[PDB]
Structures are given as structure tokens and as C-alpha cells.
Amino acid sequence: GSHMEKLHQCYWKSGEPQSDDIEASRMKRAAAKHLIERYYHQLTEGCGNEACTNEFCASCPTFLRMDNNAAAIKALELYKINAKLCDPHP
Ligand SMILES: [Zn+2]
């Protein structure tokens, strides 16, 4: 299924007759705080993927990565733009 069908918002102060998609958006964007945490973890550790093909990750096979401090800048920078978060899967 859809982990996130489409991301968009106007304001969080939606004290008006808004759509059903509002409660659906706020639950899936509630993960966006931990998205930053998964990003910072990905930019320092990486992912267990050989076919990663993404510089926005420490385990980038032919590509570059950023230092722990530079990863702190890059983590929330990748969260807002919704970059490729592989994340190390079990
Ligand atoms: Zn990766």
C-alpha cells in the first residue's frame, strides 16, 4: 500500500471545515519528527544495501557522504524535501 500517498499542507492551525485527508496527513507527517532522526542515523551509519546509488546516505557505494556534524545540517534538509531514506532494514 501507500506509506505516504501525497504530502502537502497549508497550516497546522486548521480550525475550519477541512478535508478527511487532514487527519490522514497529520498521522503520516507525525513520523516526520522521527524522519529527521532516521536521516541523521542514515548519514552516519547508512543502510545494508549494496545497490544504494544515493549520496544522501553513508553506505553510498560509489558516491560521497557527510561528517557527523555536517549530517546534523543535512538530516532535516532531507526531511523537508523528502529525499531517499533507505534506512538499515532488519
Ligand atoms: Zn542507502
Closest CA to 88 of 64, 36, 52: 52
**Near ion ligand 1, which residues have CB within 5 Å?**
47, 52, 57, 59, 86
Distance (angstroms) between ligand 1 centre and the Cα of 28 equals: 22
What's the CA gap between 43 and 15, in Å, rounded? 38
Per DSSP, 6 falls in state -
Per DSSP, 64 falls in state -
Whole-number Cα distances in Å, 19 to 2, 30, 50: 19, 18, 42
Method: NMR
Distance (angstroms) between ligand 1 centre and the Cα of 3 equals: 18
Contacts of residue 43, Cβ cutoff 8 Å, sequence gap at least 6 = 56, 57, 58, 65, 66, 71, 74, 75, 78
